Amino acid sequence: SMHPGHLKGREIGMWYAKKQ
DNA sequence: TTGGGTGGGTGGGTGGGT
């Protein structure tokens, strides 16, 4: 409800690698 | 043959690889 999760690859790593 | 640890693992492996 806050993170993508549906992303695959650097897509999610560059979306918020800052975890949460 | 579909990224890498020049990002992290109280994001996850019902996402893929080193």
UniProtKB/Swiss-Prot annotation:
Residues 3-20 are annotated as: DSM (DHX36-specific motif). Multifunctional ATP-dependent helicase that unwinds G-quadruplex (G4) structures. Plays a role in many biological processes such as genomic integrity, gene expression regulations and as a sensor to initiate antiviral responses. G4 structures correspond to helical structures containing guanine tetrads. Binds with high affinity to and unwinds G4 structures that are formed in nucleic acids (G4-DNA and G4-RNA). Plays a role in genomic integrity. Highly expressed in testis. This is ATP-dependent DNA/RNA helicase DHX36. The DHX36-specific motif (DSM) form folds into a DNA-binding-induced alpha-helix that together with the oligonucleotide and oligosaccharide-binding-fold-like (OB-fold-like) subdomain, selectively bind to Myc-promoter G4-DNA-containing structure in an ATP-dependent manner. Upon G4-DNA-binding, DHX36 pulls on DSM in the 3'-direction, inducing rearrangement of the RecA-like 1 and 2 and the degenerate-winged-helix (WH) regions; these rearrangements are propbably responsible for the ATP-independent repetitive G4-DNA unfolding activity, one residue at a time. It comes from the Eukaryota. Changing G13A: Reduces G4-RNA-binding. Changing G9P: Greatly reduces G4-RNA-binding. Found in a multi-helicase-TICAM1 complex at least composed of DHX36, DDX1, DDX21 and TICAM1; this complex exists in resting cells with or without dsRNA poly(I:C) ligand stimulation. Interacts (via C-terminus) with TICAM1 (via TIR domain). Interacts (via C-terminus) with DDX21; this interaction serves as bridges to TICAM1. Interacts with TERT; this interaction is dependent on the ability of DHX36 to bind to the G-quadruplex RNA (G4-RNA) structure present in the telomerase RNA template component (TERC). Belongs to the DEAD box helicase family. DEAH subfamily. Changing G9L: Inhibits G4-DNA-binding. It comes from Homo sapiens. It is found in: Nucleus; Cytoplasm; Cytoplasm, Cytosol; Cytoplasm, Stress granule.
